[PDB]
Design a protein around this nucleic acid. Sequence first.
RNA 1: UUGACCUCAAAUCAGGUAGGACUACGCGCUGAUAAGCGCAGGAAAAGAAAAUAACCAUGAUUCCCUCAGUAACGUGAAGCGGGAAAAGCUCAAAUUUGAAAUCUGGCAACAUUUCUUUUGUUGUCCGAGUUGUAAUUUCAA
RNA 2: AUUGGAUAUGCCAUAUAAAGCGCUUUCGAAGAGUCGAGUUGCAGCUCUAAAUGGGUGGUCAUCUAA
Lengths: 166, 115, 186, 85, 49, 391, 67
Amino acid sequence: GAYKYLEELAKKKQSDVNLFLSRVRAWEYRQMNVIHRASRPSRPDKARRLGYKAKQGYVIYRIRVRRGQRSARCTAEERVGRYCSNLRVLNSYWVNQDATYKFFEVILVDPSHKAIRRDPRINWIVNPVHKHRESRGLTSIGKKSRGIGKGHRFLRHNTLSLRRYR
Amino acid sequence: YVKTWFNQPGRKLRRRQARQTKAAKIAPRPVEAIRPAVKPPTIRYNMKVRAGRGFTLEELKAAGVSRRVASTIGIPVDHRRRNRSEESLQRNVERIKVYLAHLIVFPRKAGQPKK
Amino acid sequence: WPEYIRLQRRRKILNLRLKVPPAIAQFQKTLDKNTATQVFKLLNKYRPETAAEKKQRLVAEAEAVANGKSAQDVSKKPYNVKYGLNHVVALIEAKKAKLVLIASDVDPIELVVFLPALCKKMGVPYAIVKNKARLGTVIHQKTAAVLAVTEVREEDKNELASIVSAVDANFSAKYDESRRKWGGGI
Amino acid sequence: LTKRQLPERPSRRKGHLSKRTAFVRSIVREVAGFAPYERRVMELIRNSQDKRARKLAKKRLGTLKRAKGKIEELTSVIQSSRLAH
Amino acid sequence: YPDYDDFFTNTVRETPLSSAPEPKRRFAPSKHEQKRILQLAYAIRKGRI
Amino acid sequence: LSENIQKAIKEMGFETMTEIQKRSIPPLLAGRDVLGAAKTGSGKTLAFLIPTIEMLYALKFKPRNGTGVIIISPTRELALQIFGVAKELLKYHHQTFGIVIGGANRRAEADKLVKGVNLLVATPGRLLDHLQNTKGFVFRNLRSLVIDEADRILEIGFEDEMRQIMKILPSENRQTLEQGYVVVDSDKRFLLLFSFLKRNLKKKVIVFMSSCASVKYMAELLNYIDLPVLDLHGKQKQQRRTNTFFEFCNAEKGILLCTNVAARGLDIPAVDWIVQYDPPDDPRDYIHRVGGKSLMFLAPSELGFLRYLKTAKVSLNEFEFPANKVANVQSQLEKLVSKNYYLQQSAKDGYRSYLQAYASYSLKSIFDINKLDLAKVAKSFGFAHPPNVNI
Amino acid sequence: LEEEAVKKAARQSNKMLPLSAFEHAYIQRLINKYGTEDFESMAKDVKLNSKLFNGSKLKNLYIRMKA
RNA sequence: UUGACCUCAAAUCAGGUAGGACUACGCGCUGAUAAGCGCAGGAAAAGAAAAUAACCAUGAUUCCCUCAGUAACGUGAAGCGGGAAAAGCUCAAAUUUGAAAUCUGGCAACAUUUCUUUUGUUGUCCGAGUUGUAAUUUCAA
RNA sequence: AUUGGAUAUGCCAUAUAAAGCGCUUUCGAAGAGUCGAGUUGCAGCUCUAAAUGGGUGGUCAUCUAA
């Protein structure tokens, strides 16, 4: 399909084509609001890979963040999640940057929509345990931030364990 | 900041109850599935044998149980462990082949459309 | 002026005042008026069946089966234009397509920016036509991105060999240096 | 003990390029062009400032393994552009 | 601002690219329709269509 | 011999052992190593595998006991002739028996060897990738590594492979064992044949191909384009193959389609026309097979064989025919190869092997795979864009 | 528990499949054109193998044809 | 003049949705663990290896005992072993191309209920969707 | 009275279908401003990859992240 070509093209981020669209879209993204809704994902492959199916209930937002100390991508998950109080966050990826702003998008899912609720691949997020996932550090970059992985890299002693018989 | 063990007689019984409530549903079939015999990996314990996680994909093929009909009849599978030597493989076929010899699966009614 | 219009004329002009790379430069030089009226005349026979009247022929197919008759034994292999971006990339890589049509207004331009390069490599004659919606009208859609003829019947093969020769001779034979130099900066 | 030869895991074949992926990269290598340091290197690999060329890739990429892979990457471009142009 | 280096796509590749063989479901009646017909045909016997 | 192998041999159509087989089957069944030196078509295929299949059967080996034997073959045309009899003999047996040749899927041929194939018919190149590169392919449970065509394997160019590869595998406690020309283009290769097969419809015609699959595809298209003919290979079934050669030789007029590998040793009758639609690979055997008329379509970029036969003191004449008389029916051959699912799968698996014969061409300077035209060699077969073949 | 697990699998043991009206006639049309043995060439039949069935699948129905 | 499409708006439009309280226990944020801020459930976090090991190898996660006050540098682990419980998997990336096979919604019938309060099926008309909704597959392949 | 998973049995089903495993002369796609290096308090800033590659451990072993 087209997503094979669109993954390898999205990696050559500094080349002439990927740089020309960077200057152009950073212009349009900057005159828009700080948080403004998309209608299509700018990167329709990265969004497709990170979970976004193109059906009703999947909402793409995009938000600039000031550079220069919580990780910027994490706050783009939180600030959009405080602007949409109903939508459930799935992911948030990088689409553009400049000398003063990083641009991201976010994949958001309506838990009340009776199209998410009838679909058994995304029905895990209707459950109430997933309320404000981006708050609890429970998502793609909130897991990497807090060192939740598998590896030697990444009160349990501070209490004395006084058994009955000792 | 302590860890007091006054519930220790109670977790024993709660585990005992919830191990009997597990058996209520599974009344004719065991409360836990058969685990293989795998040798511990250190120089210290490599002469011991103990239960592991599950039967490999070629311990199970060699015994006649496919990977799909495996977890129905209560046989754990380990898609990670591999049989490096025959002895690791011949010991665990005789875990399955005794288990299949001692197990009786109740049959079921099918859904063939008629007429 | 409203809050958004003064953007709507400025992103029109910043595509002009900047340096367009040669990959994107060819996406404004476009197939003309004339030769873009016969391509869609050939395609207007090979439209996909409208989803309402595919069902209409399916209830007329499923009523005779409920009595004993059939038509599957005598059903000849269908025809239509082939659309969708992911289905047409695989129709070019397999050298099955014979005329690829690229819209000139896909909003993220990376979606089709590899197609005039892929059509040049796989030897599939190509042309960039206007108005993605114009393709969308062909296949009963809102916005199409690309189309492709892979097989017309024996009726229009002689027409197709002529209309492609208009596509190379006007798009590919011309436009040969504007695709090889930067654009914009007007 | 009586050791077996095991077959290979089907996951150890990650890192092997197919013929379809290598055709994807070759197309997108040119249609995306060259970055605003990789234009600089192609000039220095053309007029043979080789020790100067390898000095920049190490400073920009970080590691010789990458700084050697580009050489091998970009030198294939010029030796194929002399037959195109 | 150089010209366009079409060092690779200059020529034409003559072969197809994907080598997996043509499946059999492109040479027979569309078996998705044949399932779809039987849903409509069944619906006539129940008298809903 | 065992009754299960004898009844299969009875079904195979072989009862009387060859004279060379009379001096070999007695010693080979007893385990005596024999330095085989026999002529082409002298029963070297059936006799050598007869005691080898029983030797593993006497061991009563299951599929997991490893590769208990090996039969080295020097050519892809010979390997399909070797594994074909192997697939016909051990049908009443239990273990696995397959082939490993050059120019195949090196991961769908290794995946066959991870389970454990008893009689793995091998090429001199792919077997060197088994013992060294592939992991999980155990050959250390073997009994005999049979070898064939010592004079041909040494001339293949891999004369250092047979000694290097044998240094790793198990050896101890195991025994070892006037011409007619038609200068045609790459495009109108079978176009002259399709015209000749229609013009000479009432004469004794024998058409030779360089691959078993080459006969297994053009014979189906001939019968689909209303031009029936008999094949001397069939579906690798020796029952009909024995009847086909009996019927074709008894027939005074007809078209005989056969591979040159199986044609060696068969009773070649007086054919009015003898055709080789593909180039020959054996330089000495094909010249000796001539001694009606015989003419083979010579390729445009393959005049080396004409320069080789002339250097071999053999006459050659180019009997011509006007190009306007050549039928331009290569448009319906692009529609038939597009519609039929089985004719295409033969025309894709026919051109796949018929290109590897140009890869394993013994005449390296004359027939070069990298010096021919890839485009026109498909429009003769019927495919517009030549199919995706792994080299 | 042995008895309940054998008599239940004694009446629920027969898995013969009678063909449909079409499935009977589809094989019926095929078998009257080439006979009852040469199933392997029916994957090369152009018209009556309109479903492009296997060489094996036709024998699967042929067992279901008789029994 | 007219018509699509993109973008942006407006509506006491149709139907929904978010705040706030408890905070013993959970997870984050900064922080002299305390305080402050944020966010859930009956548990939560964790989770089916980009893990250990150097063996005749182990095999998601959690928890207890031990390793052990040990290695390492007053602070202070982890592998192994012994227990409790054990359940696995789902997408992206290959063309359904002999047929968008997918789904929300409006209306109407048929049911159905912890329930006249609930939850669905079928018919039908837009609409979403080819910038990709289903079938297939997740490397154990 | 509401409710559980079952057992037998009645009616429906639509199966022109779907699934397990042999057998392969065929193919086998794998997540980036991420990894990584430099550098300030796992974050910030500068720079920016590859396909038997990449990661962590002793030429080997073991894993398959974004």
